[model samples]
Target chain A: RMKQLEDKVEELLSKNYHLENEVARLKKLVGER
Target chain B: RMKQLEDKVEELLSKNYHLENEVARLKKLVGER
Candidate 1:
């Protein structure tokens, strides 16, 4: 159970990181235009 | 186990939806500028 929870937390963190990068990219695009 | 996975999937889906909207909003900003 503990392992499963750890895995889930890590997965969520990874996804949040990806989304943050995507938002940064979008901000750049808006700034460039 | 199945329920846990479903919950994780749902969380991811919600994050994805939010990110999609953010991207769309950025695109609109770029277009306006």
Candidate 2:
């Protein structure tokens, strides 16, 4: 159970990081040209 | 379980389509002056 819980947390964290990077890239591109 | 699944499918479909139109208008104005 504990291992499964850890895996779920890691998966959610990875997804959050991906979303952050995607939003950051879009914002930078919009600010540029 | 059934209730949870039923509520999930009706989700939002947000987008950034408005940005394209906005940026296009701005670029046109900037190019003119």
Candidate 3:
């Protein structure tokens, strides 16, 4: 059912948050060079 | 610059592996239900 992803969505939402954080961290790392 | 993401992509490829794993793993969890 469509609701099946409810669990997965929650997992990825948190994961995507961290992924976006990685982007921010990388940008600063690259920019400082 | 566009090249900025090169470093990111490598990071994501391996991550992308697990992201895809989420799909596969989630699929089994839901499908089997």
Candidate 4:
């Protein structure tokens, strides 16, 4: 059970990181425009 | 077991929707600029 939770947390963190990078890119694009 | 998985899926879906909306807003901001 603990291991499962750990795996899920890691997965969520990965997704969050990707989303954050995407947001950063979008902000940069807006700034350039 | 199935219930737990279902809960996690719902949570992930919620997060995905929030991120998508944020992306959409960012796109709009870039377009306006």
Which prediction has the highest lDDT against the true structure?
A: 1
Q: What is the C-alpha local distance difference test score of each model?
A: 0.76, 0.48, 0.55, 0.74
Q: How would you encode candidate 1's per-residue C-alpha lDDT over A5-24 as one tens digit per residue?
A: 75876688687878879798
Clashing pairs in 4: none
**Tens digit per residue, CA lDDT, model 3, A1-33:** 235445545555577776666556545554654
lDDT of 2 at B25: 61
Candidate DockQ scores, in order: 0.33, 0.06, 0.04, 0.36
Better of 2 and 3 by DockQ: 2
Q: Write the per-residue lDDT of candidate 2 for residues B1-33, one digit (tens) a residue.
A: 644433332221112334445555655555532
| Model 2, span A1-33: residue lDDT tens | 456545655655565565556556555655667
Q: Comparing 2 and 3 by TM-score, which wins?
A: 2
lDDT of 4 by residue, B1-33 (tens): 856875786699578768878887777766744
Worst 10 residues of 2 chain B by lDDT: B8-17
- What DockQ would you assign to candidate 4? 0.36
| Candidates 3 and 4, the one with greater DockQ | 4
**TM-score of model 3 vs. true structure:** 0.43
| DockQ class, candidate 1 | acceptable
> Which should have the higher DockQ, number 1 or number 4?
4
Q: Give me the displacement of residue A5 in model 2, in angstroms.
A: 0.9
Query: Can you tell me the CAPRI class of model 4?
Result: acceptable
Candidate 1: residue B28 lDDT (0-100): 75
Top TM-score: which candidate number?
Answer: 1
By lDDT, the candidates rank as: 1, 4, 3, 2
